[PDB]
Design a protein around this ligand. Structure first.
Ligand SMILES: Cc1nc2n(c1CC(=O)N1CCC[C@H](C(N)=O)C1)CCCC2
Ligand SMILES: [Zn+2]
Length: 139
């Protein structure tokens, strides 16, 4: 689990969105596994606006942060799960690292701020849903 709180927005994995997130929907993309909802309290996280391919991600299944090198966001094939059929997920970034389904929501972060959240995993690879192209989160 996990979310990014910036301005009057809450950013979560779409497959983990709650009833309140759906009732206060701002935007969602099944293809990216992202959902954004509105909030009453103001959020203070900083979103990275950069091209950096190294960072650190939080892994709840190990209570540890791991430094990683990750690929640029792209279309990657993702096997079937109970939330989605086997499809291509866009704006996805891959690194060699540990993950479990309960690790989705864990933040990936560089020196410039929040890069994205854990979305996928398998075969010793962890995938992150990028959020750096969502310029409207800052306004
Ligand atoms: C984080 C994670 N790590 C692993 N796994 C997962 C979970 C995973 O990839 N899902 C399941 C939830 C929806 C995700 C999606 N964006 O399509 C795909 C699956 C088992 C092997 C290790
Ligand atoms: Zn950066």
């Amino acid at each position: 689990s996990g979310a990014i709180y910036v301005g009057n927005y809450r950013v979560v994995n779409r497959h983990l969105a709650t009833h309140n997130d759906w009732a206060n929907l701002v935007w969602e993309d099944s293809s990216r596994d992202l959902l954004v909802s509105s909030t009453t309290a103001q959020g203070c996280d900083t979103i990275a606006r950069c091209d950096c391919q190294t960072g650190v991600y939080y892994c709840s299944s190990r209570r540890k942060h791991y430094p990683v090198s990750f690929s640029k966001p792209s279309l990657i094939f993702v096997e079937a799960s109970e939330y989605y059929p086997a499809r291509y997920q866009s704006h996805l970034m891959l690194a060699v690292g540990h993950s479990e389904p309960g690790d989705c929501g864990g933040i990936l972060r560089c020196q410039h701020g929040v890069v994205g959240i854990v979305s996928t995993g398998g075969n010793g690879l962890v995938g992150f849903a990028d959020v750096r192209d969502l310029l409207w989160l800052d306004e």
